[PDB]
Amino acid sequence: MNPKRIRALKSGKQGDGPVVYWMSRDQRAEDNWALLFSRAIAKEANVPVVVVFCLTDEFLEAGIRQYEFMLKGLQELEVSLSRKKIPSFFLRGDPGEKISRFVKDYNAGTLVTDFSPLRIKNQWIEKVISGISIPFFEVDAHNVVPCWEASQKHEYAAHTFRPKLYALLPEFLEEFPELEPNSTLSDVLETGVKALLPERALLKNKDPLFEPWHFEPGEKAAKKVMESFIADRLDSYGALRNDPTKNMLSNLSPYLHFGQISSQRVVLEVEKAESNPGSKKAFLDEILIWKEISDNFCYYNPGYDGFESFPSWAKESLNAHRNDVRSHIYTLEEFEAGKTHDPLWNASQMELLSTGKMHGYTRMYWAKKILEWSESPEKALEIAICLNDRYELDGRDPNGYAGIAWSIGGVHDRAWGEREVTGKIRYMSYEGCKRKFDVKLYIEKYS
Numbered sequence: 001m002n003p004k005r006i007r008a009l010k011s012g013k014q015g016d017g018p019v020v021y022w023m024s025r026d027q028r029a030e031d032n033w034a035l036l037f038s039r040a041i042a043k044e045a046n047v048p049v050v051v052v053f054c055l056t057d058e059f060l061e062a063g064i065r066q067y068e069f070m071l072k073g074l075q076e077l078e079v080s081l082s083r084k085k086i087p088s089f090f091l092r093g094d095p096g097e098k099i100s101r102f103v104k105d106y107n108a109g110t111l112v113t114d115f116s117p118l119r120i121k122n123q124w125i126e127k128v129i130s131g132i133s134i135p136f137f138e139v140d141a142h143n144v145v146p147c148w149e150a151s152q153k154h155e156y157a158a159h160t161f162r163p164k165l166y167a168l169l170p171e172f173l174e175e176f177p178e179l180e181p182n183s184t185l186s187d188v189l190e191t192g193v194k195a196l197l198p199e200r201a202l203l204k205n206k207d208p209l210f211e212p213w214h215f216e217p218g219e220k221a222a223k224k225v226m227e228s229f230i231a232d233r234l235d236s237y238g239a240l241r242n243d244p245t246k247n248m249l250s251n252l253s254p255y256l257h258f259g260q261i262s263s264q265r266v267v268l269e270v271e272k273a274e275s276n277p278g279s280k281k282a283f284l285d286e287i288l289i290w291k292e293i294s295d296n297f298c299y300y301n302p303g304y305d306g307f308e309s310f311p312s313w314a315k316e317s318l319n320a321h322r323n324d325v326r327s328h329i330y331t332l333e334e335f336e337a338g339k340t341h342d343p344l345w346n347a348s349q350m351e352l353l354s355t356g357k358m359h360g361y362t363r364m365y366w367a368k369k370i371l372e373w374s375e376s377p378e379k380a381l382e383i384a385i386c387l388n389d390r391y392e393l394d395g396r397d398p399n400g401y402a403g404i405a406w407s408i409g410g411v412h413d414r415a416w417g418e419r420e421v422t423g424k425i426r427y428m429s430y431e432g433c434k435r436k437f438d439v440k441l442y443i444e445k446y447s
């Protein structure tokens with residue numbers, strides 16, 4: 001019930017009707033600070049709470065793999081909310097128009113939303129703010145420490161962000177109070193899939209590349225992955241996280257991205273787990289430090305998807321090497337289909353296509369080779385964002401814009417030895433990787 005987790009977006013006259021939670025990022029009933037705030041507001045006002053989610057015009061920019069994972073999540077979610085006597089309302093169109101009408105049509109007293117630093121979410125907040133007059137808040141349901149309270153500027157390195165975040169953990173890492181009760185999606189899933197079908201990813205024989213069985217969706221399937229990580233894989237996490245031949249990661253990012261599970265719930269469960277001291281340190285650095293510095297990156301950098309947000313040393317170094325002859329230059333088409341000269345890059349591209357989740361270690365190798373085989377850093381940023389958002393279940397996400405800005409621009413990194421083309425940007429070599437794991441097995445597994 002910490003008030004540091006909320007920000008007033010607009011302040012206006014409180015209406016006589018239900019409190020309305022505009023679900024955007026945190027698509028779950030449990031462990032959701034934004035749902036809990038909206039309910040407490042409704043308790044004080046002697047009104048019910050309702051959930052509204054807007055299905056936007058932008059799903060045609062992604063693929064069936066994301067569209068189905070999210071909707072099957074929401075189908076389980078509607079049931080779970082109704083059992084707590086919370087109705088959920090799904091709107092087709094974009095939020096500026098559809099939230100505004102719902103607020104005026106149902107006489108809402110207060111409007112609430114969850115936090116996301118992304119540009120599109122800011123776009124929608126701007127349209128909505130104009131079209132309403134009731135008060136408007138946003139809660140950070142997605143970070144353990146509220147993005148605005150973690151740091152008041154862009155943190156340039158993880159080593160400066162780490163002591164700030166761990167200092168506030170004692171106040172913000174706490175158990176979740178239970179969600180108090182109050183006192184179709186099948187049609188839109190099928191409609192969307194037909195609109196999306198002519199863009200479905202196929203591999204020549206028209207049989208589809210995506211394998212929808214590696215990650216079942218929704219809050220229920222998320223707990224089991226979290227429970228199976230701690231039970232089975234956390235012990236070994238600290239050593240094998242950088243070996244893509246043996247999947248010992250959490251596998252939580254798809255669920256974290258759609259907000260089907262709270263990173264705070266994950267940190268709570270990992271804290272009390274008695275595992276290897278160093279695996280827990282490694283794991284907590286990723287879900288606390290690197291995930292939440294990625295929200296810090298997008299919140300404090302309007303140009304988080306452009307060259308301009310690169311650090312100075314990195315921009316002038318890449319600018320120094322702009323006219324360096326590239327060893328190869330591939331188009332978007334060849335990158336996508338996986339038709340470069342590097343079998344390791346290509347197998348990584350296929351793990352992304354077949355499963356929707358590239359191993360984290362080769363996500364680094366994959367993105368940096370795009371900087372190497374592109375005409376410019378600006379083209380390399382485009383190509384990485386496009387393929388990352390199109391094919392990753394966990395993409396269209398701060399961790400993606402930050403993970404690419406790290407790979408291609410040295411954001412949250414430091415200068416390395418100066419090379420042709422890529423300047424001082426940390427370099428990763430095919431020879432380097434086989435020294436680090438069994439590179440042939442990875443290739444064979446994705447052929």
Ligand SMILES: Cc1cc2nc3c(=O)[nH]c(=O)nc-3n(C[C@H](O)[C@H](O)[C@H](O)COP(=O)(O)OP(=O)(O)OC[C@H]3O[C@@H](n4cnc5c(N)ncnc54)[C@H](O)[C@@H]3O)c2cc1C
Nearest residue numbers: 249250251252253286287290291360367394395399400403
């Ligand atoms: C080029 C590139 C692009 C990326 N694109 C995305 C993306 O679109 N979406 C996404 O969620 N992550 C992205 N990542 C970050 C990272 O790859 C993923 O979080 C990770 O691969 C997800 O799988 P996991 O949970 O099983 O990994 P785990 O080893 O279990 O990590 C646990 C969680 O910690 C967080 N985390 C781990 N590594 C990072 C990181 N480098 N930066 C930020 N958070 C991290 C994630 O929430 C992750 O799910 C990207 C990384 C790179 C280098």
